[PDB]
Amino acid sequence: ASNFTQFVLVDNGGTGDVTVAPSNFANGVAEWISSNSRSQAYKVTCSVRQSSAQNRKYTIKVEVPKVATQTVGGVELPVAAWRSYLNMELTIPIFATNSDCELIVKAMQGLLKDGNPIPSAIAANSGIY
Amino acid sequence: ASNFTQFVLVDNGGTGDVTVAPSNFANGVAEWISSNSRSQAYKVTCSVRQSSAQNRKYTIKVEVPKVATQTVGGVELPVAAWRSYLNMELTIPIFATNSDCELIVKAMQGLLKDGNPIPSAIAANSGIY
Amino acid sequence: ASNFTQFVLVDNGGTGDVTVAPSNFANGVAEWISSNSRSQAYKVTCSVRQSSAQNRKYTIKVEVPKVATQTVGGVELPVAAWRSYLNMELTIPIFATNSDCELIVKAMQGLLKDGNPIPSAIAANSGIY
Amino acid sequence: ASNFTQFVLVDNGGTGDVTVAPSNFANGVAEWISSNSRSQAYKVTCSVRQSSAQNRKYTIKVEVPKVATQTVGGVELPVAAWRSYLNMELTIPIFATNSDCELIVKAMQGLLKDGNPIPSAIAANSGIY
Amino acid sequence: ASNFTQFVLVDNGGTGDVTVAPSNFANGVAEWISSNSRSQAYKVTCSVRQSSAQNRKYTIKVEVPKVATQTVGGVELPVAAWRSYLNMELTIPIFATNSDCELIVKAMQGLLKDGNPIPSAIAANSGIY
Amino acid sequence: ASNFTQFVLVDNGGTGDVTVAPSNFANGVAEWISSNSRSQAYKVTCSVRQSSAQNRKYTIKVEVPKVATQTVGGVELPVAAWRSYLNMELTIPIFATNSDCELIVKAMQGLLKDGNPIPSAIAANSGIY
RNA sequence: UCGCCAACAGGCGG
RNA sequence: GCCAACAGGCG
RNA sequence: UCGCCAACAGGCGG
RNA sequence: GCCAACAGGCG
């Protein structure tokens, strides 16, 4: 068994799908990267640790690049015009059972489900109103 | 129009659904809370701000409580045995178009989609392996 | 739900009723006003916040115009001679369930029911005796 | 006449009705309490004073207790788990006629009528939106 | 109802129309923006406050951008060559009835009607004479 | 050209129209007023200047009389209770061509078109909600 | 709260 | 960068 | 007399 | 608690 596999980060239909694959797992930090120029790749990292006697903390990070071609001195390189950075921390007490955790996940999925406040606001360069 | 409405945070079928409703929107921080004892309620907050000249930062927070009844001196109160805390920060450059933002959202949704590494690990009190 | 709708503030039996409607939502503070100049309007505002660790506090304010000998749409000075202000502050411990809160509301309705001491005193420009 | 009479604070349909009765008028503060131990009683107080040279102010307070039986030192005592506090102040100009005042009373009654926004939000442990 | 709706800021006859939509209400400042990158968007904001004891002030702002594509560090980014800023403040006495206010709105509309002096001068890059 | 001519400020459909006419040109500042006492008149002033090296600024001011319960030709005090003031400041970068300026004007007309948020709010003595 | 200026919900002088 | 009782605390 | 907070006819800042 | 070029920086 293994959950350190490749997965679809962005489901753009069934073609423009962005897939990330395991690239490194050093010092307790799992890292996935999309194919082609690392300079223009999507990045995802995840790590867990006992933040305290009663808490376990997950630290997840995602990088979404804006693909672009930089030309300097007639020399063009594939780069990222800029990057959007997602940084989330999830703290779960050691008393949480699997059911409790399943719930926490559902909460996260609902928070970002299509149509809900937060995702709608983000997807539209907007805030809450 | 308004996106500061109530929504389903947890989709437990069509019955045990956890819904959060707008409760307060002070100092640029939108806050939703589930019904009944505030002591045992789910909490969600969201806020946006220009973190820098080129970046806009979203700060989202979710609290998942473990419902329990505390009895002290024969007096019982509805409380939360403990709480799981989710804290995420999303940084998006001002050059991002709506399409760019739609993508970012998709990335977030995919990261937590059922079956993928991160959600599976969390839902099982596990890390990456 | 979605409670921010217009409602009848003063019920005079269908004819001569005073309806108050949404006029503002800045800072999460809900506001309703009658179809009058701001100086002669009926105003209602409401807001909720966690006033402390154990309490939540609702702040309700109402402004009622002096109608006897009033000149509709005119300039009436001094303002203090033509207006009554009601300030309500409801503190509810975070342990209060929905049921508990229903009771609290009832208590408030009972306090002001027609024929009871308080409303009777007020309506008669008197105190208790 | 005399308006210092007992009244039903909480109408539960004849059964489980909370009634408060005159209990004190010391220092010009009219007081009513439910037929309970001073520690578990519902409390209503009211007072009027000529605040300014042209204003009269009514100060009304209501205390809704959450009855419980606590065990202190191995002995059982009737107590209140917590209390909900309603504090309201009403300022009326001396130029207000009785009709002017009836208007105020009506507005307060309408403000809390079943089905209206404010009472709905309170009873639902939520804000207005 | 709810007046926080999207509207057409620039009417170009159905084709090339600039529309702005609600994007934020944080800190009591209603905001609308065009479906663009935050860097090239049209922006409209509005707020009301009780300036004096007898005045209400509306503060409206509109930003008209001159879209362009700049090359920074060999990379192309969506930017605004420059922006035109409209800042307007409207102070209305609390004694103004709704009809009084409609008068104001009409005057503002007439002030900028096609063919009238002011809009003519502005559109011609000239003064009045 | 020669734009300094009279025009209809408030269009009430031919009958009851408010026309404003040239009344002063001192210091290049154009002024228009309705046929009223200066205290009850409709006033409009406009002027342009190079506010900075890159910008030109138009300053438009409008004064609208409170009409409800007004006494034509009478002395109405305090002035602040009977008048509304509109101050507009339009900043236009020196690069703006005539075409650009036409667009800016359109944006201004759209902002105040009948049925849109801003004018609707103002006309109703309300804010955004 | 008045006068200015701006890169525009900000800055300077009153 | 970390911690938390989580719109808060320390480097 | 205005803004807060409370264990609520009391406390803090104006 | 914040910022970022983001498994990093300052209180």
A129: domain CATH number is 3.30.380.10
Question: How far is the C-alpha of D119 from the C-alpha of E8, rounded, in Å?
Answer: 38
Q: Identify which of E66, E81, E98 has the shortest CB distance to residue F125.
A: E98
Checking chain E for breaks where C and the next N are over 2.5 Å apart, the residues before them are none
Q: Write the single-letter amino acid at D24.
A: N
Q: Considering only the beta carbons, identify the residue of D70, D125, D127 that sits closest to B73.
A: D70
**Collapsed DSSP state (helix, strand, coil) of residue C8:** strand
Own/partner long-range contacts of C79-82 (Cβ < 8 Å, ≥24 apart): C79/C39, C79/E53, C79/E54, C80/D52, C80/D54, C80/D55, C80/D93, C81/D54, C81/D93, C81/D95, C82/C39, C82/C40, C82/D93, C82/D95
Closest residue on chain E to B53 (Cα)? E39
Helix ranges (H only) for chain F are 98-111, 117-123
Q: What residue has token string 């003519």?
A: E120
Query: Does D contact C via 3+ CB–CB distances below 8 Å?
Result: yes
**Residue E42 and residue E64 in contact, taking contact as beta carbons nearer than 8 Å:** yes
Q: Do chains D and A touch (3 or more CB pairs under 8 A)?
A: no
| D15 contact C CB<8A | no
Physical contact, D and F (3 or more Cβ pairs within 8 A): no
Phi, psi values for residue B74, rounded to 5°: 85, 0
Distance in Å from J8's C1' to E60's CA comes to 41
The sheet that has B75-93: what strands, in order across it? A7-10, A18-26, A29-34, A43-49, A55-72, A75-93, B75-93, B55-72, B43-49, B29-34, B18-26, B7-10
Contacts of C78 (CB under 8 A, 6+ apart): none
Q: In what order do the strands lie in the sheet with E55-72?
A: E7-10, E18-24, E30-34, E43-49, E55-72, E75-93, F83-93, F55-65, F43-49, F30-33, F18-24, F7-10
Furthest CA-CA distance within chain F: 49
Which nt sits closest to B26, CA to C1'? H7
Task: Note the residue count of chain A.
Answer: 129
Q: Is some CB atom of chain E closer than 8 A to the CB atom of F27?
A: no
- Residues D92, D50: Cα–Cα separation, whole Å: 10
Number of domains in chain D: 1
Q: Is the CB of D24 under 7 A from strand I?
A: no
Cβ distance B2 to E4 less than 8 Å, yes or no, reads yes
Instruction: Please list the residues that pair with D32 across neighbouring strands.
Output: D22, D44
CA E62 → C1' J5, Å?
33
Are D66 and C122 an interchain contact pair (Cβ–Cβ within 8 Å)? no
Token digits of residue A29: 């930090």
Output the six-digit token pair for B7: 């929504």
Q: Which of C118, E119, C84 is nearest to D86 (CA)?
A: C118
Which chains form contacts with chain D, at 3 or more CB pairs under 8 Å?
B, C
Neighbouring residues of E99: CB distance < 8 A, sequence distance ≥ 6 = C73, F67, F68
CB pairs under 8 A between C and D: 246
Q: Which residue of E has its CA nearest to A78?
A: E75
Angle at alpha carbon of residue C114, lines to D27 and C121, rounded to 5°: 30
3-state DSSP assignment of residue A122: helix
CB–CB contact B92 A102 (8 Å): no
**Chain C residues with beta carbon closer than 8 angstroms to that of D99:** 67-68
Chain D residues near residue C119 by CB distance under 8 angstroms: 105, 108-109
Which nucleotides of chain H have an atom under 7 angstroms from any protein CB? 2-7
Distances (CA, A) of B81 to A103, B46, F46: 15, 25, 67
Cα–Cα distance measured from residue E41 to residue E79, given in angstroms and rounded to the nearest whole number: 9
Bases of chain I within 7 A of a CB of the protein: 1-9
In angstroms, how far is G4 C1' from F126 CA?
31
Q: Which helix (H) or strand (E) element contains residue C108?
A: helix C98-111
Residue that the structure tokens 């009601």 belong to: C86
Residues of B in contact with C24 (CB under 8 A): none
Q: Are chains C and F in touch, 3+ Cβ pairs below 8 Å?
A: yes
Residue B75, both tokens: 């007096």
Residues 66-95 of C with CB under 7 A from strand I: 87, 91
The helix (run of H) or strand (run of E) holding residue E99 is: helix E98-111
Taking each helix axis as running N to C, give the angle between helix A98-112 and helix B98-112, from 0 to 180 degrees, rounded to the nearest 10.
Answer: 170
CA distance B104 to B116: 17
Q: How far is the CA of C125 from the C1' of I3 (A)?
A: 29
Residue of E nearest to C22 (CA): E2
Helix (H, G, I), strand (E, B) or coil at B116: coil
- The order of strands in the sheet holding D75-93 is C7-10, C18-24, C30-33, C43-49, C55-65, C83-93, D75-93, D55-72, D43-49, D30-34, D18-24, D7-10
In whole angstroms, what is the distance from residue E121 CA to residue E46 CA?
26
With H, G, I as helix, E, B as strand and everything else as coil, classify residue A22: strand
Q: Which of B23, B54, B56, B101 to substitute to test the interface with A, most A CBs within 10 Å?
A: B101
What is Dmax (Cα atoms) for chain B?
A: 60
Residue C115 burial by CB count (10 A; 0-12/13-18/19+): exposed, middle or buried?
exposed
d(CA C129, CA D7): 15
What resolution in angstroms does the PDB record give?
2.8
Q: Residues 6 or more apart from A74 whose CB is under 8 A from it?
A: none
The reply to whether E53 touches chain A by the CB within 8 Å rule is: no
First to last CA, chain C: 44
Chain D interface mutation, best of C70, C88, C99, C113, highest count of D Cβ atoms under 10 Å: C88
- Answer yes or no: is D59 CB < 7 A from strand I: yes
For residues A59 and A57, what is the distance between their CA atoms, to the nearest angstrom? Answer: 7
Answer for the pair B20, B42: CB distance below 8 angstroms, yes or no.
yes
What are the E-state strand segments in F1-129? Answer: 7-10, 18-24, 30-33, 43-49, 55-65, 83-93
CB-CB neighbors (< 8 A) of D84 in chain B: none
Looking at CA atoms only, how far is residue E37 from chain F in angstroms?
19
Would you say B56 and A85 are in contact if contact means Cβ atoms under 8 Å apart? no
The verdict on a CB contact (< 8 Å) between E78 and B100 is no
CA atoms within 13 A on the CB side of F60: 20
Q: Which residues lie across from F59 on neighbouring strands?
A: F47, F89
Omega before C78 within 30 of 0, i.e. cis: yes
> Residues C104, D64: contact at Cβ < 8 Å?
yes
Q: What is the distance between the alpha carbons of residues A28 and C87, in angstroms, rounded to a whole number?
A: 57
Q: Is the CB of C57 under 7 A from strand I?
A: yes
Asked if B19 and B57 touch (Cβ cutoff 8 Å), the reply is: no
* Distance, CA of C73 to CA of E99 (rounded, Å): 9
**Which residue of E66, E84, E121 is in closest CB contact with F3?**
E121
Partner-chain contact E38 A72, CB within 8 Å: no
- The partner residues of F62 in beta bridges, in order of sequence, read F44, F86
Write out residues 71-100 of D within 8 Å (CB-CB) of B. 71-72, 76, 79, 81
Q: In one letter, which amino acid is A103?
A: L
CA of residue A101 to C1' of nucleotide J10, angstroms: 35
Using the Cβ of E28 and the Cβ atoms of chain C, whether some distance falls under 8 Å is answered with: yes
Q: Output residues with Cβ under 7 Å from nucleic strand G.
A: E 27, 29, 45-47, 51-52, 57, 59-61, 63, 83, 85, 87, 91; F 49, 51-52, 54-55, 57, 59, 87, 91
Instruction: Kindly determine whether the C-beta of residue D63 is less than 7 Å away from any atom of nucleic acid strand I.
Output: yes
E contacts of C37 (beta carbons < 8 Å): 94-98, 100
For A31, the domain range is 1-129
Going by the DSSP 8-state scheme, the letter that residue E123 receives in this structure is H
The SS3 assignment for C74 reads coil
CA-based torsion, C108, C113, C118, C124: positive or negative: positive
Say if the Cβ atoms of A46 and B128 lie within 8 Å: yes
